[model samples]
Every structure is written in structure tokens, then in C-alpha cells.
Target: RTTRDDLINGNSASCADVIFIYARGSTETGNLGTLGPSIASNLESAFGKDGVWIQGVGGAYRATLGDNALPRGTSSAAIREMLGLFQQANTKCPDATLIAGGYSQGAALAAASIEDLDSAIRDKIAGTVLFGYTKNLQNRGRIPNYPADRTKVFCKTGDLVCTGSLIVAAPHLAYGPDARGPAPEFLIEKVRAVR
Candidate 1:
């Protein structure tokens, strides 16, 4: 189970080979259900436990009319809090690499933060994985500055969150069994490239 404590403090490993920063999607807590963890699990296993998993909470507030209209209203604040830990991790373990990723609104959060990250922190990032990346944000040119070769964006077919075509957004919840195998595999390939 992914606990909030672990998310904040991360593993106490002396020298992490790569630090995985995970941003959780809206409504869902801690790694946005399974997509984030699936990738984390595979990477941690591959790295022989030298990986640090840092998860971020992208607000749990439901969108209302006046102040809370957008469920993602607090995403920026959440990213800032997460980035504080990210910078700290880089300083505490300078040799460690970085892998930042997220799902849904969390994906949007990661996307938003990457462009503004200090070059010092940006340089350490090995790769990024975004699941259900909201197309609207991407259209606004919110792409991260990371090398395109080092990033993997997974937008499943028919996912309304990515396409914004459905009212019920059924495909938004379709990242289960289908993503379990490939998402981690994608990260594994990235880890190999960096190593």
C-alpha cells in the first residue's frame, strides 16, 4: 500500500539510483490508483531497490460553482509542494537520477511543472511518463522541456480525459489491466536508456 508518509519522506536509501516522482490524479489518492505504482514497482525491482518513490496529492476537492469550479484548481500548489521534495532529494542525493510522471489531472500537474523547473533539477531527470495527458493543456503548449526521446505519453484510445469527447468519460477509467504491463515496461526501457 502507498502511504502518504512514504510519499512525502520517500525511501531512506542512502544513494538512490533514480528518484521517481509520482503525481496523483484528481479524486484518486496516492499515485492515481495503479498506473503510477505499476511503473514504480517495475522500476524499483529493476533498480535493485535503489529507487525512491515520491508521490504527490493533486488535491481532493470536488469542483463547485464559485471558487472550486475546476477540480484541478489546487494542482499548481500541489506541484510546488512536490517540487520542494524533488529539489531536496536532488540535493540530499546528488548522484541520483530523476523520473517524473503522473496520470490524468496528475499528468497535467507534471506537465505544468516541468517547463518551470530549475535547470539544476531539470538536468537530473532521466525521463517522464504521462498517462491520460489532457489534450487541452498540451494544445496550450505546456509540454515539458525534457527531451522528447526521454518522455513517454500514453493516451489510450477513447479516453475522454485526453480527447474530451465523452460526457461520462468512461475511457478515462480504462487504464487498468491494459496499462499494468506496458506502463512499467515503458519505464523499464527508459531506465535502460538512462543507465
Candidate 2:
């Protein structure tokens, strides 16, 4: 492994190889559900621990059944918060590779957050990563305006969340383990290309 360096905590704003903003899924705490943080950890494993800044989307809305069932009101606040954070990352560290992601309902929030993003902030985002996206339950595809090449989505065989169903299956909550390999591989490739 290479020498550890360029470590910056999430949302604190510092130059780094990668800056990942993650939204927690419904019912998970700390803005990073099991899958979100696991992906961040996987990135660290490859590029040196803490080399990437893993910022969680802070409190803007509750990750509850109310928000999950009817995102009409709750989503706007989170989307606004996410957009602001994305801007902050670019302004604070213009050259750092930026990626946004989420787990389950949080993934849906991340998708919405990218809509009509400010042009200035648009190209700065190198990629997106979403796990067990709930939007898939609505028969949706990759986030709008975001190219499929730069996006990574995880939908396990048994995950009903991504299988177009409302019922949450056990696989829906199993992404933490899934983050160990290919997930980090995606981040590594994006960071390398961005650099």
C-alpha cells in the first residue's frame, strides 16, 4: 500500500483524491447507512485510509416512514441540502474528484438532488454511486441527465427495493458486505480518470 496522505473528514472541505457525499437510507443514522459508509471504507482501503473525504448528508429531513412513503415534502429539504453540499465541495476544493451516493431511499434523494444541477457544479461531479435505490421500486432507471457510464447502482438478486416492490427484503439491507470489492473498484477508476 502507498503511504497514507491527504486525509480530510467529510464536509470539512479539503483537497483530496475523492470527495464522496452520501445520504443515508430510511431509518439509518449519521447520513451514511450500512451501504454508504461501507462504500467509503472500501475507497479508503484502496487509496490509503481516509484519503477520500466521506461526508454524510446532514440533518435536513427525517429518515422515517412518513418521508419514505411520501417524499413530496421531505425530499425537497434533503435535495436542497445535498445541492448546497455539492456546491461547497467544488468551491472549497475545485480539483478534488467528487462523487455522490446513497442507500435505498437516500439513493432516491441523491438522484433527485442532481436534477438540473447548476452548470458550474455539473462537470465537477465525476460520478455517482447508489445502492439498493428505492427509485427502482417505482420502475425508474439511472438518475436523469447522469450518464450510465459514470453511475454505479447495486440491486441484489433478492432486494425487493430495486426489484420494483414496496416490501423491503433482507437483501435490501445487505449492501454493506457488497461494498468491499467492485464498489471500491468503481471509485478508484473514477478518481484515476478525474486526476
Candidate 3:
């Protein structure tokens, strides 16, 4: 039931009531990263182990610093990988409420994946959690056209990545349980509606 061990590219032995499609940040050790697991654990705490399944994106691209200079600030492979996970979650866990989230570049990847989904699948997404979102680099705090009420973006004070800059500082790494702000509670409500 470990979130890091439940990489979407690897383990998914059981169908979860809430399938969390999580993408890791740059240079992170595992698919979801240190901060991601803490976030994932929040959902696990709310719903318990049997109620939530964390599925990390397994894209074929490196989360390089150079990627921040790209047009979208995220890798194409990761975007596609995120898309596939969304698609897979619906079929694998038909009754599950899908939750999407990520950190840094992975946060951007989740938004990109959500954008490309068919309306039917897109509607199934109950909530999204983004920490240190790279999209903030564009001076936009959120993904355009998405339900703003359904999304929560955490941009720590002094986090340049969230200030329309490419600079990665200590603030960029400051997201976790304590830094999550209302994200855990946000999911608790959004996920409770259907799950």
C-alpha cells in the first residue's frame, strides 16, 4: 500500500476506490518523490489504505532543469504518460473517483494530461492538487478552462518557480504535509462527494 511502490508504470494489483495519478518532481528519488508521498499519504489517511491507490506517472523523459525552459515547462513523455494513467484508471476502477496531482514539472504534466482527455473522462476527475506548479512560471496560477473550484494550487511564498521565474530555490522544495495548506482538506471534500 506504499504510494511510492505503487508506480503506475509498475504495481497496481488492486482496484482503488480513489485512484490518485501522481507525477513526481525533478530529480526526485522515486516516481512520486518525497513530497508527493506525503501528499498521497494525506488521501490515504482520509480514506484509509483500501480506499486509495496511488499511481505515479512513468514517463520516458528525465525531469531535467533544462525542461523548465521548454514551451510548457514539462516533458512530452510525462504528459502522455499522465494521459494514459487517467485513461487506465477509469477502466480499471470504474467506480473510483479519479484524483490527479503532482509537484513542479510533474504538476504541469498533470494539467497537460487533463487537458487532452475526452470530456467523458475529464468529467470523471473529482479533484487535482498541484504543489510548486510550473504553470505558475507563466504568470498563471492555474490551468485555464479547468474548474477553478475543483483545483488547488500551492505556491509557497518566495518560491520563484511560482513567481513566473525559472529559478529553483529552497521554497520550491518546501511543499509537503505542512506546506499543503488546504489541499488535504480540499481532497477530503471533493473526494467525499462521489467516493
TM-score per candidate: 0.78, 0.85, 0.88
Query: What digit string (tens of lDDT, one per residue) describes model 1 on residues 16-54?
Result: 676677766556644445566666666667776545554
lDDT of 3 by residue, 1-195 (tens): 223534354334576777777777887766777666676777788899777877777656466777767777777776777787787787766777888787888888877888778888888888888888878756367665568888888888998878877688998877765434477678778989865
Count of backbone clashes for each model? 0, 0, 0
- lDDT string for model 2 (1-195, tens) is 111112224434446667778777777766675666567777877777656777777757466756766543136777888887887787777777788777777788878877658766766677787888777655356877677788888888888778666678888867776676777677678877878
Full candidate order by TM-score, most accurate first: 3, 2, 1
Q: What is candidate 3's local distance difference test score?
A: 0.74
Candidate 3 weakest lDDT stretch, 10 residues: 1-10
- Per-candidate RMSD, Å: 3.7, 4.3, 2.6
Please report how far candidate 2 places residue 30 from its true position, in Å. 1.6
- Please list the residue runs of candidate 2 whose C-alpha ends up more than 4 Å from where it truly belongs after superposition: 1-13, 71-74, 137-139
In candidate 3, which residue pairs clash? none
Off by over 4 Å in 3: 1-13, 137-139, 178-181
In model 1, state the lDDT of residue 100.
78
